[PDB]
């Protein structure tokens, strides 16, 4: 079906518990985009 | 978790010495929570090295026009000044939220978005599947203009991918 999220709906979920562990995919790649 | 309509893949381009292998597939996600989990742990565009790109495309679509999903398409281009006056980070995020939130009526026409960090200027582009489809591009372009608050003096320019690989010609302007 059609799942439409407003900007508000999306930002509202920015600080959930799962939104705050870190990402899953972390391959052995050394790049400067990762935050520190 | 809150599911997204589509599965999205984040790519990151970084200059290295490689030709087309400079593009790195970071990860994919299909929920709002996992999007933020990724976004919260990567540097914003303003902190990215010169020459590097962020690209968010639907699953199985490569951030290159050669892809079968982009081959007949084009992109809405936003050009931005290097100055701090520009709200580069929040503008890129709003583009991402537009994508994953499916703010466009022609959702199937959206392929992804790309932000380029270059020397003279920065470019944010929204890629669509079919350049010939005027009704699709315009509906998308108008959603962008109304969502991004670009202003009177700033314009959205739609460029066919074929015209890029040749001061690029635009066929629509908003």
Swiss-Prot record, chain A:
Summary of subunit composition and partner proteins: Interacts (via YXXXXLphi motif) with eIF4E1. Interacts with DDX6/me31B.
Domain notes: The YXXXXLphi motif mediates interaction with eIF4E1.
Subcellular location: Cytoplasm, P-body; Cytoplasm; Nucleus
Top-level division of the source organism's lineage: Eukaryota
Entry's family note: Belongs to the 4E-T/EIF4E-T family.
Tissue: Expressed in all larval and adult organs and tissues, with highest levels in the ovary.
Annotated gene: 4E-T
Protein known as: Eukaryotic translation initiation factor 4E transporter
Function of the protein: eIF4E1-binding protein that regulates translation and stability of mRNAs in processing bodies (P-bodies). Probably plays a role in P-bodies to coordinate the storage of translationally inactive mRNAs in the cytoplasm and prevent their degradation. Acts as a binding platform for multiple RNA-binding proteins. Required for the formation of P-bodies.
Sequence motif YXXXXLphi motif, location on chain: 5-11
UniProtKB/Swiss-Prot annotation, chain B:
Post-translational modification: Phosphorylation increases the ability of the protein to bind to mRNA caps and to form the eIF4F complex.
Expression sites by tissue: Expressed at the posterior end of developing oocytes (at protein level). Preferential expression in the pole cells, at different developmental stages.
GO molecular function: eukaryotic initiation factor 4G binding; RNA 7-methylguanosine cap binding; RNA cap binding; translation initiation factor activity
Residues that, per the record, bind mRNA: 19-20, 65-66, 118-123
GO CC annotation terms, alphabetical: cytoplasm; cytosol; eukaryotic translation initiation factor 4F complex; muscle cell postsynaptic specialization; neuromuscular junction; neuronal ribonucleoprotein granule; nuclear body; P-body
BP-aspect Gene Ontology terms: regulation of translation; RNA metabolic process; translation; translational initiation
Coiled-coil blocks: none
Location in or out of the cell: Cytoplasm, Cytoplasmic ribonucleoprotein granule; Cytoplasm; Nucleus, Nuclear body
Keywords recorded for this protein, A-Z: Cytoplasm, Initiation factor, Nucleus, Phosphoprotein, Protein biosynthesis, RNA-binding, Translation regulation
Domain of life per record: Eukaryota
Family: Belongs to the eukaryotic initiation factor 4E family.
Function, in words: Recognizes and binds the 7-methylguanosine (m7G)-containing mRNA cap during an early step in the initiation of protein synthesis and facilitates ribosome binding by inducing the unwinding of the mRNAs secondary structures. In 0-1 hour embryos, forms a complex with me31B, cup, tral and pAbp which binds to various mRNAs including maternal mRNAs, and down-regulates their expression during the maternal-to-zygotic transition.
Subunit (UniProt): eIF4F is a multi-subunit complex, the composition of which varies with external and internal environmental conditions. It is composed of at least eIF4A, eIF4E1 and eIF4G1. Recruited by cup in oocytes and in early embryos, preventing the interaction with eIF4G. The interaction with cup therefore prevents the translation of key transcripts such as oskar (osk) and nanos (nos) in some regions in the early embryo. Interacts with mxt. Interacts with 4E-T and Thor.
Protein name, UniProt field: Eukaryotic translation initiation factor 4E1
Lineage, opening ranks: Eukaryota, Metazoa, Ecdysozoa, Arthropoda, Hexapoda
Recorded name of the encoding gene: eIF4E1
